[PDB]
Design a protein around this ligand. Structure first.
Ligand SMILES: Nc1ncnc2c1c(-c1cccc(OCc3ccccc3)c1)cn2[C@H]1C[C@@H](CN2CCC2)C1
Length: 296
């Protein structure tokens, strides 16, 4: 008997992947743009993103890397970035993913600053993100680091849920580190996450509210002008982000619902999609988790 990563149908021969450029570093190591052969059915070649570890010599980072990639093997949603494969045998350890050609949502939103995104465009982004999150929550996954920087933009401008590795510790389920060296995205965090480190579908809804505010401000810094320590206290004392200039009333109203102090008073992602579904593009019905037979 053994409890090591076991190569499966997701394993890809090393010789079938080439890297061509740097895309940037989120969790773990550099992400590269490249090409993988035989990863998509009836495509000989596929443009892909290829993720590495940060520290070559760390077996623990290696195992954690692969455990986190294995989580994605379960996901099949138009609004979540897809896993395409894994190179686990020998070094370097590689994770092969759907290439999101327009980069991260935060960088995208910043690029639109000098007309600004129309309400309809904003709603469309919101519903796509909420749909991805509804799928994940329905599959018992709590993202914990939802933020524009961890949503990704497709060639066709579809927003999809991305990097969830930044705040996952290797030992967390069995062991606690006293005090805590853990990374905490405080400006995106619910009062109960700030208080006790509790992360649920409800705290993901809180972060979603902050992503809406990022969309409406074109990725201004939430609580700009407060330190990290000041944000933590401010939000735990019931502080809220202000309504952005020229924010459509309906969007701010959504933020307000997501930012109920008590987690049980917050909408679910399904309830958010429900409230905005009529303002989504017609194609949303055909690609969404919300309208799929999985949504039961
Ligand atoms: N698919 C992609 N396509 C194109 N670029 C991508 C991605 C992903 C990408 C997308 C989805 C998931 C993901 O982590 C999953 C995971 C988690 C844990 C272990 C193994 C894998 C990475 C990140 N980037 C870029 C690298 C840049 C990071 N920046 C933006 C802020 C810092 C953005």
């Amino acid at each position: 008997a053994a409890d090591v990563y076991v190569p499966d149908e997701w394993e890809v021969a090393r010789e079938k992947i080439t890297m061509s450029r740097e895309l940037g570093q989120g969790s773990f190591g550099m992400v590269y743009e490249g090409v993988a052969k035989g990863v998509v059915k009836d495509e000989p070649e596929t443009r892909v993103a290829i993720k590495t570890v940060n520290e070559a010599a760390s077996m623990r980072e290696r195992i954690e890397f692969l455990n986190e990639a294995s989580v994605m093997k379960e996901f099949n949603c138009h609004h979540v970035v897809r896993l395409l494969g894994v190179v686990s045998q020998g070094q370097p350890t590689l994770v092969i993913m759907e290439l999101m050609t327009r980069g991260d949502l935060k960088s995208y939103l910043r690029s639109l600053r000098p007309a600004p995104p129309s309400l309809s465009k904003m709603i469309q982004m919101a519903g796509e993100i909420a749909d991805g999150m509804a799928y994940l929550n329905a599959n018992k996954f709590v993202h914990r680091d939802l933020a524009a920087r961890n949503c990704m933009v497709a060639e066709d401008f579809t927003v999809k849920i991305g990097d969830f590795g930044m705040t996952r510790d290797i030992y967390e389920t069995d062991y606690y580190r006293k005090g805590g060296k853990g990374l905490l995205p405080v400006r995106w965090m619910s009062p109960e996450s700030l208080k006790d480190g509790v992360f649920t579908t409800y705290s993901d809804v809180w972060s979603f509210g902050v992503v809406l505010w990022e969309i409406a401000t074109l990725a201004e810094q939430p609580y700009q002008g407060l330190s990290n320590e000041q944000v933590l206290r401010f939000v735990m004392e019931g502080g809220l982000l202000d309504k952005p200039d020229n924010c459509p009333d309906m969007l701010f109203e959504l933020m307000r619902m997501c930012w109920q102090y008590n987690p049980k008073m917050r909408p679910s992602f399904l309830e958010i999609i429900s409230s905005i579904k009529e303002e989504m593009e017609p194609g949303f019905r055909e690609v969404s988790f919300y309208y799929s037979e999985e949504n039961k």
